[PDB]
Design a protein around this ligand. Structure first.
Ligand SMILES: [Cu+2]
Length: 127
């Protein structure tokens, strides 16, 4: 129980707004998929993890980075883990070390495609 399957869809939502990572896990894996019909340049989604304090800067700088950079500032030290940006019918996975998390803190998981984090934002918590 050290992975989660996340979908981002044409309605600009992930399937979850709260991810729990079992603290017995040494690594955690997010398997993102896009069950919609819309292409990456219209309704692209990524899955990006940061602290709550860093989310807004990652989102804003991501928009400024452009589609060709997956709407994610390259080499952003604030990004704990992230997938690539995907469109309809694609999938992407990322694994990260659970040592990057700590109990008692709600981390933020979000998409940086412009506008999406109005809905595509939620918490991740080690329990
Ligand atoms: Cu998105």
């Amino acid at each position: 129980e050290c992975s989660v399957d996340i979908q981002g869809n044409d309605q600009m939502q992930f399937n979850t707004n709260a991810i729990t990572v079992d603290k017995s896990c040494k690594q955690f894996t997010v398997n993102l998929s896009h069950p919609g019909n819309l292409p990456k340049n219209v309704m692209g989604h990524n899955w990006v993890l940061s602290t709550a304090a860093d989310m807004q800067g990652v989102v804003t700088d991501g928009m400024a980075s452009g589609l060709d950079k997956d709407f994610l500032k390259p080499d952003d030290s604030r990004v704990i883990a992230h997938t690539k940006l995907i469109g309809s019918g694609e999938k992407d996975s990322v694994t990260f070390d659970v040592s990057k998390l700590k109990e008692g803190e709600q981390f933020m998981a979000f998409c940086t495609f412009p506008g999406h984090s109005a809905l595509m934002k939620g918490t991740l918590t080690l329990k």
